[PDB]
């Protein structure tokens, strides 16, 4: 019993099946394109039942060359991706086919990418910090174990270096793994990331899942779910903490909108799919902590027209627990990881969750940096000498505080050879308490660059 293609309109394909064999929703059907130049095995995802035994499917690959009347075979299960430690060190597409080694992983355990999020009673009832070891992240924008982190930035602010640092830290400090869901990934950027991770030797610790831009909207929509299914396998079967990158999750929303438009569904407010919130929830709610093991996610979010009230970012930000904004200005000053201390924010920076001392120190640091940024306008025009003695003291202290937020990231070990530093949260809190009290303002500013804590601060001060 096999189907038959009856309507082809771009990515949308309608398939008629015998009355007793109509596939259920989200099943993956296979069709053959036999034309020599475009020979392929189309993977169609059933989207709707049209009645009369017809099913409307979103083709995951270009339908060019497809012929009416061509046999369609039902796999009996939704798009299933490979899972296990085998997926580490390799790059896959949305459908589970390996790109860097075709045919690899076809015999691993295969998991459906359509999985319900954890039952209500399985969720953790209290938010827990993720001690990532970075001074800036731990102090000012503490991440959430099982939470979602916005990652703003671009080229030339070290976003890839930060991603490598987080992969290294999750792999080594927490003994976990990583999955990089390249939704709407530029093929050039995908190749660059693949080679960079291979050279940094972190590819062995992460599984890459690229839904390229040139692929039709179906794969760009389902690649996040595929990567998150790999992450779920690592969380629930291997018992490993996972860090799931989803760069860029606006492109997930956009692909969903495109698929909705293709299927003929009337657009919502700003042209987005009516089920926008439902789709974002289905993606994000699976990113959570359960049974003591969690999937954290760093999700670069594109904000169209810089409009945070737009339905796409507005829906995405209802799920994000922290924000890390990489600034070109901070990067130009040599302050890697390039996190903007002020424009970044976190929903855990509250005395209830973090320690009261932690909140006090972080707020003091934020106040000092805010005051310094306000004085920067005066400094850049009138000169540093025009300020008052209190202003000069605060400017020096803020310079040293912001430069101390830099760290010798593990991602830099490949270049400079200095082992990466993991600064405990307590040490960071006490160090920044001292910095804000001025106990270290007599050191040169160069002493605080790229040092992992107080002991390294003293050693570098002695070296200067």
């Amino acid at each position: 019993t096999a189907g038959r293609v009856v309507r082809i309109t771009g990515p949308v394909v309608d398939v008629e099946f015998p009355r007793g064999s109509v596939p259920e929703l989200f099943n993956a059907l296979h069709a053959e394109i036999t034309f020599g130049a475009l020979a392929k095995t189309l993977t169609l995802e059933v989207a709707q039942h049209l009645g009369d035994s017809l099913v409307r499917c979103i083709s995951m690959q270009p339908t060019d060359g497809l012929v009416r009347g061509v046999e369609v075979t039902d796999t009996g299960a939704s798009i299933s991706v490979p899972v296990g430690d085998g997926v580490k060190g390799h790059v896959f597409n949305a459908l589970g086919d390996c790109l860097d080694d075709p045919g690899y992983g076809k015999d691993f355990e295969h998991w459906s990418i359509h999985r319900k999020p954890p039952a209500f009673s399985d969720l953790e009832p209290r938010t827990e910090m993720l001690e990532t070891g970075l001074k800036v992240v731990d102090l000012l924008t503490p991440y959430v174990r099982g939470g979602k982190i916005a990652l703003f930035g671009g080229a030339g602010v070290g976003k890839t270096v930060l991603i490598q640092e987080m992969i290294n830290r999750i792999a080594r400090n927490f003994g976990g793994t990583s999955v990089f869901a390249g939704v709407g990934e530029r093929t050039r950027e995908g190749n660059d990331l693949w080679v960079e991770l291979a050279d940094a030797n972190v590819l062995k610790d992460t599984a890459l899942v690229f839904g390229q831009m040139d692929e039709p909207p179906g794969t760009r929509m389902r690649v996040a779910l595929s990567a998150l299914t790999m992450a779920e396998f690592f969380r629930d079967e291997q018992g490993q903490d996972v860090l799931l990158f989803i760069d860029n999750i606006f492109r997930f929303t956009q692909a969903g909108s495109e698929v909705s438009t293709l299927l003929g569904r009337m657009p919502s407010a700003v042209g987005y799919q009516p089920t926008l919130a439902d789709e974002m929830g289905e993606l994000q709610e699976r990113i959570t902590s359960t049974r003591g093991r969690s999937i954290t996610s760093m999700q670069a979010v594109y904000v169209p027209a810089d409009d945070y009230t737009d339905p796409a970012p507005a829906t995405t930000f209802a799920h994000l627990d922290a924000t890390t904004e990489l600034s070109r200005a901070v990067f130009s000053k040599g302050i890697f990881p390039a996190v903007d201390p002020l424009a970044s924010s976190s929903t855990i920076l509250d005395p209830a969750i973090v320690g009261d001392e932690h909140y006090r120190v972080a707020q003091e640091v934020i106040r000092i940096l805010q005051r310094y940024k306000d004085l920067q306008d005066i400094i850049a025009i009138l000169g540093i000498d025009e300020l008052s003695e209190e202003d000069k003291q605060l400017v020096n202290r803020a310079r040293r505080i912001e430069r101390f937020l830099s760290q010798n990231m593990m991602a830099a070990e490949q270049f400079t050879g200095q082992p990466g530093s993991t600064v405990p949260l307590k040490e960071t809190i006490e160090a920044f308490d001292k910095l804000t009290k001025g106990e270290f303002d007599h050191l040169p500013e160069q002493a605080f660059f790229l040092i992992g804590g107080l002991d390294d601060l003293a050693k570098k001060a002695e070296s200067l």
């Binding site: 009337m266 657009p267 407010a269 700003v270 042209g271 027209a305 409009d307 009230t309 737009d310």
Partner: protein, 47 residues
Amino acid sequence: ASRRRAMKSATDNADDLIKALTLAANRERQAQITQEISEIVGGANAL
């Protein structure tokens, strides 16, 4: 000194006005997109 205070106040007021106008412009942009899509899909539904 009075000019410094007045111009700081003016800059703050102009920044608040910029934020309000940006919010209004975003609302109008979203409304225009929604209205355009409503017209297009109304024309489509009537065939």
